[PDB]
Amino acid sequence: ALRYPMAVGLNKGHKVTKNVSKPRHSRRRGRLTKHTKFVRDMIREVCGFAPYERRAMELLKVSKDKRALKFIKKRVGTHIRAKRKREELSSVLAAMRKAAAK
Amino acid sequence: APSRNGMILKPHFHKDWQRRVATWFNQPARKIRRRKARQARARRIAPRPAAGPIRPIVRCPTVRYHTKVRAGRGFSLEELRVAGIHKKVARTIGISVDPRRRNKSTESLQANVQRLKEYRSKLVLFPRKPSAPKKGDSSAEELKLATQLTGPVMPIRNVFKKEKARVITEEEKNFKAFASLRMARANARLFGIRAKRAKEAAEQDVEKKK
Amino acid sequence: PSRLRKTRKLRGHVSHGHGRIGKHRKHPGGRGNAGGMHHHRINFDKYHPGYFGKVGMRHYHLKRNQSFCPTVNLDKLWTLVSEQTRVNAAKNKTGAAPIIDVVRSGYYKVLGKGKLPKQPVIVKAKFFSRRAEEKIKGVGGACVLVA
Amino acid sequence: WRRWHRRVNTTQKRYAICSALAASALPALVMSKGHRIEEVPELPLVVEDKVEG
Amino acid sequence: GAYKYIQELWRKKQSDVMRFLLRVRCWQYRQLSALHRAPRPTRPDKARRLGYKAKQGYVIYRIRVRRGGRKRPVPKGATYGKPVHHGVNQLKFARSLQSVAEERAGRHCGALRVLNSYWVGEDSTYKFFEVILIDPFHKAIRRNPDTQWITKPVHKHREMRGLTSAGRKSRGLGKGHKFHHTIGGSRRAAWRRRNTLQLHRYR
RNA sequence: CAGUAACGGCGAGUGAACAGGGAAGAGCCCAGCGCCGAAUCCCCGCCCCGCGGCGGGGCGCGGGAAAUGUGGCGUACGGAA
RNA sequence: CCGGCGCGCCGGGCCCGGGUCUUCCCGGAGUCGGGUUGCUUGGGAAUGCAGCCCAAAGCGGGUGGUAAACUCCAUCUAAGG
RNA sequence: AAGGAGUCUAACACGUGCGCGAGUCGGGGGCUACGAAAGCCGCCGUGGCGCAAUGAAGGUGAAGGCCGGCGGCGCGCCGCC
RNA sequence: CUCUAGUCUGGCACGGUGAAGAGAC
Ligand SMILES: [Mg+2]
Ligand SMILES: [Mg+2]
Ligand SMILES: [Mg+2]
Ligand SMILES: [Mg+2]
Ligand SMILES: [Mg+2]
Ligand SMILES: [Mg+2]
Ligand SMILES: [Mg+2]
Ligand SMILES: [Mg+2]
Ligand SMILES: [Mg+2]
Ligand SMILES: [Mg+2]
Ligand SMILES: [Mg+2]
Ligand SMILES: [Mg+2]
Ligand SMILES: [Mg+2]
Ligand SMILES: [Mg+2]
Ligand SMILES: [Mg+2]
Ligand SMILES: [Mg+2]
Ligand SMILES: [Mg+2]
Ligand SMILES: [Mg+2]
Ligand SMILES: [Mg+2]
Ligand SMILES: [Mg+2]
Ligand SMILES: [Mg+2]
Ligand SMILES: [Mg+2]
Ligand SMILES: [Mg+2]
Ligand SMILES: [Mg+2]
Ligand SMILES: [Mg+2]
């Protein structure tokens, strides 16, 4: 078959050789280090928990996950941040169980 | 009141436009001032080129201009690293550098590397001490023939590859260009819904086995 | 040249070309496009049909550069290359066909309107229309797509 | 901000230069400008290059 | 380093320790005057991040401003005009309370220069900010080439010309499609160029 | 670009930005994170010089600032050992 | 008369780099963001600014000009100068 | 007696004169007393307008006829070289 | 007709320390 480069379609565009470079160092940001993770959870046992997430853990303990998601969404804003907060706020709930189980 | 036939015009003269009127009676005065400043700068950098540092080979985005080529702001760090030029020394010998640029392609990268090599071959470098020559610099016979360049350094010119009149083959006579354009447009438009319908067809028919 | 204007011939005439009964008052019908619905409706409908109302979809961040597609018809296809490109293929005997790159001349889509001279072509274009490719195939030729 | 300046097409400026130059090699047209050229030997009056010195 | 711990410590303002400290400090600053000198920065890591260096000539002033919107200063009702401009109660000031606090510090201390400011507490009726001030005529600032830019007469009353961070946030400047209306020097600079008719010689 | 996309009793009217061609073109520094004996800064007394934009070196078991953090390396283009 | 452009000398500083591996380290919080209110913008289910309330995260966050969920991409690194 | 009232700028329409002509235009920039003028640039024609329209939009985008051979329909038609 | 000072009323925040009791799912 005779194929040609096209400006439309599923594989449109001029054809070049994509070289591979090192990833840009501005893109690194947001990654945890072993030291800042230690600092943040160190501040976590020193401080404790906020009053709204203390209520949300009580909501997640009785397995009302949808109401816990809606409460966290109304309290902090967006659905993505609500899901990310609920996942860590249930992982700490599971961590408190395996510490007191044995 | 409108006349018989004409345009509906909307003149934007409802504010106090007469206060902010910019007249151009100092245009031939600013042209002389810019020319005198340009010549004073050209005399200040006496063997250095009057345009400044060399600008790289750069493609234009935004499909109206993607066939043209242009002078960019600076050579990228990948280009300088392949060419073997340190980024804090390149600005001292008239190489324009910006660190924001990326290199998605290979052909433009190697074109700018060749651009750096050909400028490095043309660079006539004076010793830092005029009374005593150094290692990586030009000899005394080139410094006395060293002049000042006028215009941009290595000017950027759009080249087109000339092609022979070729004998048309039978498979080039069978290529349907408009049919290929229409079917490629349809296959780009209908790609997601075809995959979702195939997923539903594979999901409804796997319920039969279980 | 104010000496050629109508004002110099209107000195001595009292109303200055503007009428004794209906004077040259300031704005006797409103300012600008006033009363397009009400008292200039007959002019606005007899000369500007369609001026009031909403038609079609909105597009918020429209940039004109995305839909840039300049067109050339096939009656201008042979003007993009030189004359000695055209006459050498006419005097040519091996059947080699010259290549016309319309993207180099600054055109994206080739439409087919006029005639083509009876000689083979290889037209490289970003887009083609159907009658444009059939008029090239009928004279005997290639329609090469480029991106 | 009155329009003081006018722009003229380059081809018309050159055309007027050609028309003014071609009229300077004619007898009656330079006489009718009033120039006293009754004893001038040739109307395209061309001299040698040491005049610049 | 301890500064990273204090920084992550101040991000947990809903914790018991920080709600105790913020409440007792807000009570303490509520008993003082509306503007007074702090002997040292209350929040040292954040003062350090904003540009405070603990050396001679760097001054910290603590200041409180009243909260709420901006009532229009007009007699009883009676803001005379069309119904668009009858609004008096629910109007809002275009500049932040931190920017008000910076200029209230900088006007009372006119011999110094405002560098930055930070929040240290609030309640229903007051917000408390601490302002970093630099003496431009102390020799520790004059002879340090890193911080001798502030001594220049260009930087007189940055907090009044909106060149600090807090007053800078209210001008709507920045790079992008969201800040088209301040292309140029500022919002008024964009307006001048867009509403200036360019009348050329040859048109 | 453009009186355009858009806003507007979608009426009167208002109304940018990107790409492109030029004028000019120059880039950088902290905090943090770390390592160096605070390795840093200011003032007063004396000696000589400069001295009309108050500076330079030498002394002072002289005084302070600063460990609730000054200076050197180092900043997102990565950096340090 | 003033200043620039230079040379020699004295008294000082500064005691310096590049490349390939290996081991480490890396970020600005009542701030982002969400709701609501008012002004503003061409910005239209909210362009920008501000008051009040809520209030973060770290394969994170912002942007991707129609609100929302899922999934990929692309592009920067805000709240210091 | 003196002064005293359809002006100037922008936009549009139509007519008229000039130049070039499917092109045309340097207005912005640059080069080189009157002269702040004039001249020049063409890989400075970017860009504007014209050379293509239509649809809300995805999009599409400006004569055909005869003959021979082949295939199908039941002498004509369709498709195919 | 369309708004507005002031005023009445509800919610959130400043805004805590305990005792009882009545509650809905
Ligand atoms: Mg009339
Ligand atoms: Mg009459
Ligand atoms: Mg009259
Ligand atoms: Mg009349
Ligand atoms: Mg009338
Ligand atoms: Mg009448
Ligand atoms: Mg009138
Ligand atoms: Mg009526
Ligand atoms: Mg109004
Ligand atoms: Mg136009
Ligand atoms: Mg209406
Ligand atoms: Mg407006
Ligand atoms: Mg641009
Ligand atoms: Mg340039
Ligand atoms: Mg340090
Ligand atoms: Mg940066
Ligand atoms: Mg903000
Ligand atoms: Mg207002
Ligand atoms: Mg408005
Ligand atoms: Mg997306
Ligand atoms: Mg969308
Ligand atoms: Mg910054
Ligand atoms: Mg910045
Ligand atoms: Mg008179
Ligand atoms: Mg005409």
UniProtKB/TrEMBL annotation, chain D:
Protein name: Large ribosomal subunit protein uL4
Residues of the whole record sequence present: 122 to 174 of 439
Lineage: superkingdom: Eukaryota
Family according to the record: Belongs to the universal ribosomal protein uL4 family.
Subunit structure: Component of the large ribosomal subunit. May bind IPO9 with low affinity. Interacts with RBM3.
Function in brief: Component of the large ribosomal subunit. The ribosome is a large ribonucleoprotein complex responsible for the synthesis of proteins in the cell.
Source organism: Oryctolagus cuniculus (Rabbit)
